[PDB]
């Protein structure tokens, strides 16, 4: 039996650079063609990958010492050094890089002072000792820090490759040097290609565990086509939603898996948009969304209504084991929507503009979700026109970064199992704060390191919802058909979704 498969993806690859990759498709690819110090296991816990063991923690929980294993290698056969990591991380925090991942490094001493421009990037409290030892100093004890070290943003990059390619690093398949279970062997255009192939990396330190010779990927935007290909043996998986999920729900090859992933309506609150600057308008939008109808009828695939910004089944209190997301903080209420809208009309000039644009990805169900929301908003906010604008993923990312939007159907999947993975995105000058929400009291609640941290973060979530700085819609369930012959693929509800390292084909 040939060890090959063709799997699916939701968008083209957007980045091949750890420093700049922030979307799920790019991150899944990087999790499979590259590797970091730690890699998540089947329980979403960081286990030693390039690192030879868990960190040795000293200095009252603030100093982490990590040893790189003997035989950890780049695809060109050269050793991965501690210095590769030092330079890689300096590169992420360097303001010249303009990395969307800079906030992930905030725990490390001087990362804040580098962000303000008070200090140079060489002050980042990370150093090599010899070629194989890393020492890191944190500002304070940070229980999830080993989890951060498993993220693609913390992956090394090869110093030689970075020196060679400079600003063109990651421009194409030829301008990277990787170190993972697979090599990227076919990818024509970053940002545009609907197909790519990865192949077993024989220079990978743990190549003995890898069975697949190659894995092909195909972007699927139209579910009917994915299913038809799947049934003809032209795809080994097919994504499902709506009527398609309804019909395949009882199939032996069907599964649905709940993700730590909230889809939002992000709202431009910089002042450019006069409607979304008004708090009553934002609250009207929130109350107008019939989340249960969306998930039952439109998605119908194990997705669930949002109860807050933070999704369910992600983070549990160490002391009492309670889910963080244990309060119903948002809920459909048509009459309150109508009333908040009537209140807003008294405060704004409707002559100027009574219209809101909604950006969505141009895939089948993203467009359909946008149209569902359009009808909900138009039905409860009398006189409001909502336009839906489906666009390609690379254009969508750029417009979010530039705040060239009004409303946006976009979401976040937790990178690690703590509420702060979500809540940090709404901090005043966070790169992921696309809407420009700013509440200084929210910012401060996020900094709590006391025995009451859990409670303080919940207060922050409530302040965000009370201001209605972002509208949570639904928590994503991933439904699909998958051929029975596919074995041992690791699927994660947090971080990079798929790990194909130990994948194999049986019968």
């Amino acid at each position: 039996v040939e060890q090959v498969a063709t799997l699916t993806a939701g968008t083209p690859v957007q980045s091949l650079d750890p420093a700049t990759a922030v979307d799920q498709t790019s991150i899944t690819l990087l999790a499979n063609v590259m590797e970091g110090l730690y890699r998540l296991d089947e329980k979403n816990q960081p286990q030693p990958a390039i690192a030879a063991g868990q960190p040795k923690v000293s200095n009252n929980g603030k100093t982490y010492t990590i040893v790189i294993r003997d035989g950890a290698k780049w695809s060109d056969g050269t050793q991965i050094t501690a210095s590769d990591f030092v330079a890689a991380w300096q590169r992420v925090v360097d303001p010249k890089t303009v990395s969307p991942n800079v906030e992930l490094f905030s725990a490390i001493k001087n990362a804040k002072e580098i962000a303000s421009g008070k200090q140079a990037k060489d002050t980042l409290a990370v150093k090599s000792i010899g070629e194989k030892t890393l020492e890191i100093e944190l500002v304070e004890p940070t229980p999830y820090f080993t989890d951060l070290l498993s993220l693609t943003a913390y992956y090394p990059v090869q110093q030689k490759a970075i020196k060679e390619y400079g600003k063109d690093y990651g421009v194409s398949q030829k301008a990277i040097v990787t170190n993972g279970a697979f090599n990227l062997t076919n990818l024509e255009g970053v940002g545009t290609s609907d197909k790519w192939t990865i192949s077993k990396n024989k220079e990978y330190w743990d190549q003995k565990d890898v069975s697949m010779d190659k894995i092909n990927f195909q972007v699927v935007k139209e579910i009917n086509t994915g299913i038809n290909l799947y049934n003809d043996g032209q795809l080994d998986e097919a994504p499902l939603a709506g009527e398609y999920a309804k019909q395949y729900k009882k199939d032996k090859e069907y599964s649905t898996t709940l993700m730590a992933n909230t889809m939002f309506l992000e709202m431009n609150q910089t002042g450019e948009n006069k409607l979304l600057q008004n708090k009553n308008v934002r609250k009207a939008i929130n109350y107008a969304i019939d989340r249960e109808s969306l998930v039952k009828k439109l998605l119908d695939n194990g997705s669930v209504a949002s109860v807050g910004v933070v999704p369910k089944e992600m983070a549990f209190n160490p002391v009492n084991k309670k889910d963080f997301a244990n309060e119903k903080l948002v809920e459909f209420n048509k009459k309150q929507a109508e009333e908040y809208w009537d209140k807003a009309k008294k405060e704004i000039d409707l002559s100027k503009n009574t219209s809101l644009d909604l950006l969505v990805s141009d895939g089948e169900f993203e467009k359909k979700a946008g149209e569902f929301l359009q009808g909900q908003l138009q039905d409860s906010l009398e006189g409001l026109k909502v336009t839906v604008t489906p666009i390609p993923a690379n254009v969508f990312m750029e417009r979010l970064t530039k705040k060239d939007f009004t409303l946006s159907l976009s979401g976040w999947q937790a990178d690690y199992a703590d509420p702060i993975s979500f809540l940090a995105n709404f901090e005043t000058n966070s790169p992921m704060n696309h809407g420009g929400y700013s509440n200084k009291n929210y910012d401060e609640l996020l900094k709590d390191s006391s025995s009451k941290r859990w409670q303080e973060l919940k207060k922050a979530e409530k302040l965000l919802i009370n201001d209605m700085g972002v509208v949570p819609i639904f928590q994503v369930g991933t439904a699909k058909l998958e051929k029975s012959k596919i074995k041992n693929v690791l699927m994660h509800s947090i971080g990079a979704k798929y790990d194909y390292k130990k994948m194999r084909i049986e019968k």
């Binding site: 939603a241 992933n261 997705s303």
Partner: peptide
Amino acid sequence: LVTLVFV
């Protein structure tokens, strides 16, 4: 990480 697509 950012999710522009959910199916």
